[PDB]
Write a protein that binds this ligand. Structure first.
Ligand code: HEC
Ligand code: HEC
Ligand code: HEC
Ligand code: HEC
Ligand SMILES: [Ca+2]
Ligand SMILES: [Ca+2]
Ligand code: NA
Ligand code: NA
Ligand code: NA
Ligand code: NA
Lengths: 376, 354, 129, 126, 376, 357
């Protein structure tokens, strides 16, 4: 009913009338919680970018963090910190490149570490959450490098130093499962398990091939570290689910996000973060719309919600806006976050009914990535 | 009632029978003709005052009593800043606890004890009547009650409208009764957009009902020793005035060198300035703040000496965050500020501006 | 929504550009990026410098001096941008000028502009305004 | 207007429009809009040697051509004529067809910031 | 009426059809000329910004130059280089500040000098063209400093070095008249002449106070170095003109840009760059509209053109868009450039007839400043 | 006329009577059964060829004549980049200028002079008949005329469809007659998106009508001396092959160490590789390029020797801007390129591919 700006005007008016004093100062953001959500704005490849720290419950911006060129945000699941790997240049977009990792306090937002990465080793790509990743103990950050070859950089957040680059096969993305282990998806259609020490050749093991060369796995799979569930849609809304919770890859039965008549009538996923996974509900959310097959990065206006075990459809919400990315809060009665890069607005929906509840607009230039902590 | 009490304080305030040799009253040092400060020329000029014995000088400048009754009782606020109290170092809680101190101070009025004070009170038939009517029969026969009642009367006398009339040009202008001159309003605008309002305004924001141009806090602004005054005080060239840290009970090292933000009311007529009277001119006091902001050679030099200011007497806990504003007051703004400060003069002291 | 019309102060929503205290704000209302009406957002640094304006409060019919202070050391918030200029004078009257980045005095020498707060610092009272 | 989900329709009459036929797998900004040309970089920027390809249908001649996009690097994003097309675009693990990647490798001075992309033909489709 | 992108599709189809080869390469901008126009985007106080180099004749962006926080562009009137004073930080908007000057080659857009300014001495302010200025010989760049006090920094572009700061009094803006002289406008209503040798205090002498304490002169006067004409509108459209062509300040007759009637119906200048001056035509252009007295920075929809010598109005144009800034080319039959911050679009008009010819859209986020070289 | 001139060239091409000891014809070193390259073993393996005296070795590897007729005559474009010509260093202008040179090269066919060549042509009645019909009576009696006429015949013969049939799988695939294997298609895609296409495609952009996988420019890729071949040639431990700078008339020290980009047609069958025959295996020639891109220690090691590639014979004027692409070819991409390059084999040499694969 009453907006935040209206509630604020009323309270200031009342302080003025009461002669209430108060010191102008620097606010602390409220304690991180399950309804905190972070929206990162790669700003369509601009050299400097913004992340917005949002209270999902109030639909309120509670803070912001600056970053450089296509930074990779990560959010520790227990809420104790956030961090990103970022890239700056001495003369805006030109001159000496410095890649670095910053860790921030989640309440004051102040950097508590600034760790230089030797030899500008970050992969510059449109933001894929799983190209930079925290190990489950929060002590290490792993970042992907593409050039000169696929590699993974190991950064010690606790000791605040870069450790080493690991040579990997021709693989992509980084899904950590342990303090020293992560999975990558390879060009051959397998997953590679990479187990690394402080020094020495990583132990690299491939799974079986789990998809044909002509089924295409999207750049934004959902991964729940706490569930070890990797949820990987193909262009057609076919969903591969891989269970990494044993430490080794177990291939779950494939489900179809869309029915055969929908597929015959041109329904396909599309957007950026096309898929979200709610761990406690074991539920998959997929951004889908009617579209030609090579329009797979365009916004979608519908989310199908399906049971991850049976593949049964539970809902098909009509989002009512052009949505590129989705994610969910991981608490019960979760929120469904639906970010429009076009509208620069995060729409905050009730994940159960699909109802839009509120929204936060003016989130940068081309905001694309939603992150939440899984604190439960 | 609250009236008779004050009228008793009025009598004690000008009575030299409260000094050992009966040569000085509170009004000797806090001269009502000089906004309750000391006109009397001494070994260190007007920097410090001379006690009842005719030779002992204090180590601190005698402050106005105008508006002192607006200062809250000493306390530490929820952000850990000490506020309020009386004396430059806040060592008295309030006016009541302050009043008995000059009476017994050997460097000031120099009564030997509460009893000798009670003796002098009994010698006067009019005090017998006045005290007895307010505190009851035999009050003066008891040195403790006599002394406490005298402090009480003085404190009440200091809380009357006479010490705080709010009739300065500034007050009239805030009532919309008059306007500031262009120069004065520039000064006001400067005073509240530049650092000064960080310390010399009652509140952080909103409007104060009775502004006295101090937040009642303690700040070390990094002042040097007043050479001649320190010499005259006899406290020794080794001595360090620790400001608030000298208050018994304050142990925090961070308070060393800190002094109470004085009220700027009547500042134009209660020179010399700072806790030790080191600067004779108001303009100099304002200029001292440029030592923290200005790059220019002249900023490092006290215009009164033509020599550098001096190392701070206490070189730590400087309030750098407030003082290093990044902005220098040019001649024009220093002029505007003098003009603005002069508007904080009570109506009765307007003639002294000359 | 007619930008040239006399500005009509309101006292019912601080996030809007016509909020009475924003009468000479230039930049972004801090309350839209995690600050509040008179506090800076986390991670930013509060300047000690200000520019001031006398802002009419439609509610009590009184005029208040607003001493704008910048929150510095972040890129501009991008949220709730506003430029009003009531009583605003050119740079050679800097006390009333608001193109100036008023980040002086900010901790860590922070000089980049993120957003502005609108605290009241007095009643009064200007000749020009 | 213009359905973002509709099948893309190439045209061979305006290189600054996102449906221009060579832009069928472009991601970013057309260099022609910031001082480059269809196949040259703007002054001040550095020309990458890496590229992603696509097979783009040319409705002028009925032939499909291989377009090997190359970034102009070392400047902030131009912000003029943004476009994102993904005809035949494959995920990042098939990087020669993947267009989210900043294809700035080989650019002089190690420039790796993305400014815009050019659309030269390098072959006939097969 | 064929657009540049259509003409380009046609030449490309023809090269393809004729089998014509060409080497993918870095283009050079066309030689600087009178119709080149630069639009600076301060980007509403963003930490990095952009300059657009535009061929005004063609309405085509021919290059761009990146800048940091509120940089001050300058353009050598002879077309031989451009430059800016800029400001970067080691972590986007936080950490160590570097102020610096870059000089750029005007066809390659490559930097030819990068000159550190010590102790971060730049004045950080919404962009005033005359807060940083080239001397007529192009060998020196002078920039304003505000903090701790008004000062002017002397940058040797020839030896590529910072020289020193000049003490000045309480004055503002920098109008160079000679290799060793510039004027400033003072708080007291005077102009200050500053003459600097190689050593010591400059020699500073004041003019007569030339306006009352209550006549407000705008932050964006027009100043033609080559004519020594300082054109200074006040808030009511009153225009001060100061002749600095003799080495000392002579005051021209004050002139009114709006009719005494018109001011009564709420006509006032408003915008950013409210005024332009054409040197060869001796002609003042002024952005005016009907507004409240304190809406002085809002867009305007009308330009009035008056003769500098007499004040005779020559035309009043209905711009047809919300214009914040104007300027003109300095050749014959000048263009009148009308930049809309709101539209991010430079509208290019015939300055004779005021008709719109062409326009260049997508000029960043909040473009504000138009600069042109006076080459004739 | 055009038939006959080429037919006369076909005849000279296989004729050993054009060598001093009569042991050697063009076809001896440019063997049609091996894509016009030399199958013979010498003191440096197949790196360099042995002349008619049975002892003298050249310092460069004998190149294919296939597709050599597609190369433009030598010139400097407006880039100031030299293009075209014959010989690894471009020192012949075109096929015709080149053809007489083996004939008189004491290291190759070793005829003493043009008159000795003319006297050989006169000895054969079919040459008197063939030459005189194309060039007029008594042509063979004028040694300058006989020599120039033989060079023309031989250039014309190298221009026939026989030398450049364009009937490789690549061609058949580009005609829509077949498809690449998936390995091949990937090799093609790598070829055209990686740095190889900056030098091994005719055109900077557009589509070539007769692609021969070279842009005909000159690049120093920073190859080491081939030690055994250099010892066999006898040119000296201190000799430097300056490449293009050795062409007479070229003075620019920036041209030192630059060699003409070879057509990659038939590359699979015409090993060993590079101008001095330094690498035996096609894979090795591809791996050489990773030395400028890879950070792995193995990238600096020649897999044929297990030792560093070696200092460049000419350490300056390297094509670093092209070579240092910032991306390393992994093994999957190298196998993909081998497979692609093998599709470049003319139909008649496909059977040779067996003992490469
Ligand atoms: C000169 C010999 C004095 C006589 C007699 C009295 N006072 Fe005083 N006063 C004097 C000094 C030097 C100081 C400051 C001393 C210090 O250590 O800071 C004071 C201070 C006060 C104050 C506090 C005012 C404030 O902190 O702003 C009060 C309330 C005060 N004095 C009152 C007072 C009374 C009631 C007196 C007669 C009993 C009296 N003073 C005598 C100098 C002298
Ligand atoms: C807190 C950091 C302060 C700021 C900023 C300013 N002032 Fe101040 N002032 C302060 C203290 C703690 C004191 C007493 C210091 C001491 O140890 O003596 C003062 C004193 C003055 C005086 C002397 C008044 C007197 O009765 O002696 C004047 C005239 C004064 N201050 C004015 C002033 C102005 C004009 C300022 C902005 C330039 C200003 N002060 C800043 C505390 C602080
Ligand atoms: C072995 C002793 C050879 C005989 C007999 C012939 N050629 Fe040759 N050829 C040989 C070498 C070692 C080289 C390269 C030498 C160098 O300095 O670069 C060549 C090269 C040619 C070329 C140039 C091909 C190219 O640059 O791609 C042509 C056209 C050529 N050879 C043809 C040719 C003819 C026509 C011959 C009989 C007259 C002949 N060659 C003999 C090795 C030998
Ligand atoms: C120009 C900078 C080049 C780039 C990029 C690539 N190649 Fe190349 N190649 C080049 C030259 C100048 C030469 C001859 C070098 C010499 O001095 O001998 C070559 C040679 C080859 C060969 C050997 C062919 C033969 O001997 O007949 C092969 C197989 C080859 N090149 C392939 C190749 C590939 C696959 C590339 C991308 C990795 C590549 N080259 C890049 C010039 C250049
Ligand atoms: Ca005093
Ligand atoms: Ca060979
Ligand atoms: Na003294
Ligand atoms: Na103490
Ligand atoms: Na060898
Ligand atoms: Na030569």
């Amino acid at each position: 009913q009453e907006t935040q700006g209206q509630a604020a005007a009323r309270a200031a008016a009342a302080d003025l009338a009461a002669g209430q004093d108060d010191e102008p100062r620097i606010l602390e953001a409220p304690a991180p919680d399950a309804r905190r959500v972070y929206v990162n704005d790669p700003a369509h490849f601009a050299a400097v970018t913004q992340q917005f720290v949002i209270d999902g419950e109030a639909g309120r911006v509670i803070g912001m963090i600056d970053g450089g060129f296509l930074p990779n945000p990560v959010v520790a699941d227990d809420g104790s910190f956030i961090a990103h790997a970022s890239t700056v240049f001495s003369r805006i977009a030109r001159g000496e490149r410095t890649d670095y990792v910053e860790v921030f306090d989640p309440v004051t937002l102040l950097p508590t570490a600034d760790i230089e990465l030797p030899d500008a080793p970050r992969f510059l790509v449109g933001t894929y959450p799983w190209m930079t990743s925290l190990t489950p103990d929060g002590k290490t950050l792993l970042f992907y490098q593409f050039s000169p070859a696929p590699a993974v950089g190991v950064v010690d957040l606790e000791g605040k130093a870069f450790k080493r680059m690991l040579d990997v096969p021709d693989c992509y993305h980084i899904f950590p499962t342990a303090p020293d282990t992560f999975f990558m998806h390879c060009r051959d259609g397998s997953l590679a398990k990479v187990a690394f020490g402080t020094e020495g050749t990583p132990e690299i093991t491939h799974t079986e091939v789990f998809h044909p060369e002509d089924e295409f796995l999207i750049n934004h799979p959902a991964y729940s570290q706490k569930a070890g569930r990797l949820v990987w849609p193909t262009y057609t809304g076919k969903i591969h689910q891989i269970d990494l919770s044993s430490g080794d890859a177990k291939f779950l039965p494939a489900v179809e996000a869309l029915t055969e008549a929908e597929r015959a009538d041109g329904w396909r996923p599309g957007g950026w973060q096309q898929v979200a996974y709610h761990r406690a509900l074991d539920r998959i959310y997929l951004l889908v719309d009617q579209r030609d097959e090579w329009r797979h990065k365009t916004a979608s206006r519908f989310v199908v919600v399906l049971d991850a075990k049976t593949g049964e459809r539970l809902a098909k919400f009509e989002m009512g806006h052009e949505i590129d990315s989705i994610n969910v809060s991981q608490d019960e009665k979760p929120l469904l976050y639906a970010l429009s890069t076009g509208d620069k607005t995060l729409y905050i929906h009730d994940a159960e009914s699909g109802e839009e509840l509120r929204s936060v607009n003016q989130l940068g230039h081309g905001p694309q990535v939603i992150t939440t902590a899984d604190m439960g | 009632a609250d009236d008779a009490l004050a009228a008793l304080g009025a009598q004690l305030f000008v009575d030299p029978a409260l000094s050992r040799n009966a040569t000085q009253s509170c009004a000797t040092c806090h001269d009502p003709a000089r906004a309750f400060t000391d006109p009397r020329e001494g070994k260190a000029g007007l920097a410090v005052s001379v006690g009842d014995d005719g030779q002992s000088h204090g180590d601190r400048n005698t402050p106005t009593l105008g508006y002192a009754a607006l200062v809250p009782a000493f306390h530490r606020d929820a952000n850990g800043k000490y506020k309020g109290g009386q004396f430059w170092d806040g060592r008295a809680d309030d006016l009541k606890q302050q009043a008995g101190q000059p009476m017994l101070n050997p460097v000031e009025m120099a009564m030997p004890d509460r009893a000798a004070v009670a003796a002098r009170l009994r010698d006067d038939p009019a005090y017998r009547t006045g005290f007895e009517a307010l505190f009851g029969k035999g009050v003066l026969d008891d040195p403790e009650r006599a002394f406490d009642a005298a402090a009480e009367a003085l404190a009440a006398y200091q809380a009357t409208g006479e010490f705080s009339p709010f009739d300065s040009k500034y007050d009239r202008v805030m009532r919309g009764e008059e306007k500031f001159t262009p120069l004065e309003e520039f000064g006001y605008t400067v005073f509240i957009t530049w650092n000064c309002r960080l310390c010399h305004m009652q509140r952080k924001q909103g409007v104060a009902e009775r502004e006295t141009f101090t937040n009642f806090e303690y700040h070390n602004i990094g002042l040097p020793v007043n050479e001649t005054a320190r010499e005259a005080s006899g406290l020794g060239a080794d001595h360090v005035d620790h400001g608030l840290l000298a208050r018994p009970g304050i142990e925090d090292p961070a308070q060393s060198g800190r002094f109470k933000v004085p009220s700027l009311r009547n500042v134009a007529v209660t020179g010399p300035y700072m806790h030790n009277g080191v600067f004779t001119d108001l303009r100099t006091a304002i200029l001292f703040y440029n030592k923290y902001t200005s790059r220019r050679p002249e900023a490092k030099i006290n215009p009164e000496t033509g020599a550098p200011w001096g190392e701070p007497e206490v070189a730590r806990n400087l309030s750098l965050a407030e003082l290093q504003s990044g902005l220098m007051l040019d001649d024009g703004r220093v002029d505007a500020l003098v003009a603005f400060l002069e508007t904080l003069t009570d109506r009765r002291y307007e003639p002294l501006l000359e | 929504t007619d930008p040239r019309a006399k500005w009509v102060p309101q006292d019912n929503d601080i996030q809007a550009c016509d909020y009475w205290r924003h009468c000479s704000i230039d930049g972004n209302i801090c309350d839209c990026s995690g600050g509040s009406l008179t506090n800076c957002p986390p991670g930013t640094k509060l300047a000690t410098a200000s520019w001031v304006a006398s802002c009419y409060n439609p509610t009590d019919g009184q005029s208040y001096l607003i001493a704008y202070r910048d929150c510095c050391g972040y890129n501009v918030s991008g949220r709730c941008p506003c430029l009003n200029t009531e009583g605003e004078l050119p740079v050679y009257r800097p006390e009333f000028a608001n193109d100036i980045i008023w980040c002086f005095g900010a901790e860590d020498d922070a000089m980049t502009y993120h957003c502005t707060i609108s605290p009241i610092v007095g009643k009064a009272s200007h000749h020009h305004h």
